[PDB]
Design an enzyme around this catalytic site. Structure first.
Site, PDB file in Angstrom:
ATOM      1  N   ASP A   1      23.453  78.066  64.882  1.00  0.00           N
ATOM      2  CA  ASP A   1      24.304  76.879  65.254  1.00  0.00           C
ATOM      3  C   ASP A   1      25.724  76.969  64.709  1.00  0.00           C
ATOM      4  O   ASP A   1      26.458  75.952  64.740  1.00  0.00           O
ATOM      5  CB  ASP A   1      23.598  75.554  64.840  1.00  0.00           C
ATOM      6  CG  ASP A   1      23.244  75.501  63.355  1.00  0.00           C
ATOM      7  OD1 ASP A   1      23.926  76.225  62.545  1.00  0.00           O
ATOM      8  OD2 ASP A   1      22.421  74.620  62.997  1.00  0.00           O
TER       9      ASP A   1
ATOM     10  N   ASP B   1      20.336  71.302  65.332  1.00  0.00           N
ATOM     11  CA  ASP B   1      20.016  72.001  64.101  1.00  0.00           C
ATOM     12  C   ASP B   1      19.098  73.124  64.427  1.00  0.00           C
ATOM     13  O   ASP B   1      17.986  72.884  64.869  1.00  0.00           O
ATOM     14  CB  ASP B   1      19.402  71.041  63.131  1.00  0.00           C
ATOM     15  CG  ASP B   1      19.276  71.614  61.717  1.00  0.00           C
ATOM     16  OD1 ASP B   1      20.229  72.264  61.255  1.00  0.00           O
ATOM     17  OD2 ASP B   1      18.303  71.217  61.073  1.00  0.00           O
ATOM     18  N   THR B   2      19.569  74.333  64.213  1.00  0.00           N
ATOM     19  CA  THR B   2      18.730  75.526  64.251  1.00  0.00           C
ATOM     20  C   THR B   2      18.121  75.824  62.891  1.00  0.00           C
ATOM     21  O   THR B   2      18.647  75.482  61.890  1.00  0.00           O
ATOM     22  CB  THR B   2      19.503  76.752  64.713  1.00  0.00           C
ATOM     23  OG1 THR B   2      20.690  76.948  63.942  1.00  0.00           O
ATOM     24  CG2 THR B   2      19.855  76.600  66.205  1.00  0.00           C
TER      25      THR B   2
ATOM     26  N   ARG C   1      30.711  74.662  64.001  1.00  0.00           N
ATOM     27  CA  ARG C   1      29.334  74.168  63.906  1.00  0.00           C
ATOM     28  C   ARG C   1      29.042  73.352  65.152  1.00  0.00           C
ATOM     29  O   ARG C   1      29.794  72.440  65.543  1.00  0.00           O
ATOM     30  CB  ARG C   1      29.182  73.346  62.634  1.00  0.00           C
ATOM     31  CG  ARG C   1      27.846  72.640  62.413  1.00  0.00           C
ATOM     32  CD  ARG C   1      26.668  73.589  62.242  1.00  0.00           C
ATOM     33  NE  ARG C   1      25.454  72.940  61.759  1.00  0.00           N
ATOM     34  CZ  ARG C   1      24.593  72.277  62.551  1.00  0.00           C
ATOM     35  NH1 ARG C   1      24.766  72.210  63.884  1.00  0.00           N
ATOM     36  NH2 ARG C   1      23.506  71.764  62.006  1.00  0.00           N
TER      37      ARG C   1
ATOM     38  N   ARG D   1      34.537  73.316  59.058  1.00  0.00           N
ATOM     39  CA  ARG D   1      34.012  73.851  60.326  1.00  0.00           C
ATOM     40  C   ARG D   1      34.409  72.970  61.457  1.00  0.00           C
ATOM     41  O   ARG D   1      34.328  71.735  61.350  1.00  0.00           O
ATOM     42  CB  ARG D   1      32.458  74.022  60.281  1.00  0.00           C
ATOM     43  CG  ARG D   1      31.959  74.765  59.079  1.00  0.00           C
ATOM     44  CD  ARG D   1      30.480  74.941  59.074  1.00  0.00           C
ATOM     45  NE  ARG D   1      29.810  73.651  58.892  1.00  0.00           N
ATOM     46  CZ  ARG D   1      28.501  73.475  58.793  1.00  0.00           C
ATOM     47  NH1 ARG D   1      27.638  74.483  58.855  1.00  0.00           N
ATOM     48  NH2 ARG D   1      28.049  72.254  58.785  1.00  0.00           N
TER      49      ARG D   1
ATOM     50  N   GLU E   1      17.507  77.940  59.596  1.00  0.00           N
ATOM     51  CA  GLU E   1      18.320  78.971  58.893  1.00  0.00           C
ATOM     52  C   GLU E   1      17.656  80.339  59.137  1.00  0.00           C
ATOM     53  O   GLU E   1      16.449  80.412  59.471  1.00  0.00           O
ATOM     54  CB  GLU E   1      18.457  78.689  57.403  1.00  0.00           C
ATOM     55  CG  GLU E   1      19.003  77.317  57.018  1.00  0.00           C
ATOM     56  CD  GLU E   1      20.458  77.055  57.423  1.00  0.00           C
ATOM     57  OE1 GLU E   1      21.266  78.008  57.419  1.00  0.00           O
ATOM     58  OE2 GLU E   1      20.803  75.879  57.722  1.00  0.00           O
TER      59      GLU E   1
HETATM   60  C1  LIG Z   1      26.438  69.032  62.809  1.00  0.00           C
HETATM   61  C2  LIG Z   1      27.177  68.367  61.652  1.00  0.00           C
HETATM   62  C3  LIG Z   1      26.941  68.713  60.314  1.00  0.00           C
HETATM   63  N1  LIG Z   1      27.621  68.079  59.329  1.00  0.00           N
HETATM   64  C4  LIG Z   1      27.400  68.363  57.912  1.00  0.00           C
HETATM   65  C5  LIG Z   1      26.253  67.458  57.504  1.00  0.00           C
HETATM   66  C6  LIG Z   1      25.420  68.264  56.534  1.00  0.00           C
HETATM   67  O1  LIG Z   1      25.895  68.089  55.140  1.00  0.00           O
HETATM   68  P1  LIG Z   1      25.047  68.818  53.956  1.00  0.00           P
HETATM   69  O2  LIG Z   1      25.611  70.223  53.814  1.00  0.00           O
HETATM   70  O3  LIG Z   1      25.601  67.901  52.923  1.00  0.00           O
HETATM   71  O4  LIG Z   1      23.568  68.888  54.175  1.00  0.00           O
HETATM   72  C7  LIG Z   1      25.692  69.711  57.009  1.00  0.00           C
HETATM   73  C8  LIG Z   1      24.638  70.257  57.908  1.00  0.00           C
HETATM   74  O5  LIG Z   1      25.074  71.500  58.421  1.00  0.00           O
HETATM   75  P2  LIG Z   1      24.115  72.799  58.459  1.00  0.00           P
HETATM   76  O6  LIG Z   1      22.869  72.499  59.274  1.00  0.00           O
HETATM   77  O7  LIG Z   1      24.956  73.893  59.039  1.00  0.00           O
HETATM   78  O8  LIG Z   1      23.773  73.047  57.039  1.00  0.00           O
HETATM   79  O9  LIG Z   1      26.857  69.677  57.787  1.00  0.00           O
HETATM   80  C9  LIG Z   1      28.553  67.070  59.672  1.00  0.00           C
HETATM   81  O10 LIG Z   1      29.119  66.549  58.724  1.00  0.00           O
HETATM   82  N2  LIG Z   1      28.854  66.724  60.906  1.00  0.00           N
HETATM   83  C10 LIG Z   1      28.157  67.295  61.921  1.00  0.00           C
HETATM   84  O11 LIG Z   1      28.388  66.928  63.053  1.00  0.00           O
HETATM   85 CA   LIG Z   2      21.150  74.750  60.499  1.00  0.00          CA
END
Ligand SMILES: Cc1cn([C@H]2C[C@H](OP(=O)(O)O)[C@@H](COP(=O)(O)O)O2)c(=O)[nH]c1=O
Ligand SMILES: [Ca+2]
Length: 129
Positions: free
Chosen positions: A15, A34-35, A29, A75, A37
């Site tokens: 993702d 959510d994919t 991103r 991102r 890891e």
């Molecule tokens: C998809 C997305 C993720 N995020 C943030 C929330 C999550 O914070 P945390 O890192 O605090 O868990 C993290 C999840 O991304 P990943 O799934 O790439 O880890 O990215 C956003 O803030 N906005 C979004 O639209």
């Molecule tokens: Ca992910």
């Protein structure tokens, strides 16, 4: 919402991807998904799917939603299209991603993606097997 050009720099995982956008390298991103890891079950296959879809494309585009365009990690937050097909929807449709991270004001394609998820789940695909 409007599609904007970008070019692939490099695949990262299910993702996230490195693209050039307005001439600057950015990690993107994918909105609303959510994919797993890479180390988790179906992570490898999510990565491969995203990689293939974007490496084979002639034309990558990114579409920002109405809300924040960058997350707290810097991102880019977008829908990504490979030759006009949405990567975010394709991952969900194949049971390689779940609909997730649905925040108010950046959720234009929520219902499209939920429909794909219901169909992947019916078919017992990948994550839903
Ligand atoms: C998809 C997305 C993720 N995020 C943030 C929330 C999550 O914070 P945390 O890192 O605090 O868990 C993290 C999840 O991304 P990943 O799934 O790439 O880890 O990215 C956003 O803030 N906005 C979004 O639209
Ligand atoms: Ca992910």
């Amino acid at each position: 919402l409007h599609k904007e050009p970008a070019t692939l720099i490099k695949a990262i995982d299910g993702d996230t991807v490195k693209l050039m956008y307005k001439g600057q390298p950015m990690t993107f991103r994918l909105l609303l998904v959510d994919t797993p890891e890479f180390n988790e079950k179906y992570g490898p296959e999510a990565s491969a799917f995203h990689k293939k879809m974007v490496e084979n494309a002639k034309k990558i585009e990114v579409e920002f939603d109405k809300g924040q365009r960058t997350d707290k990690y810097g991102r880019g937050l977008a829908y990504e299209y490979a030759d006009g097909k949405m990567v975010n929807e394709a991952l969900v449709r194949q049971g390689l991603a779940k609909v997730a991270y649905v925040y108010k004001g950046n959720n234009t394609h929520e219902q499209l993606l939920r429909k794909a998820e219901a169909q992947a789940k019916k078919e017992k695909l990948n994550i839903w097997s």
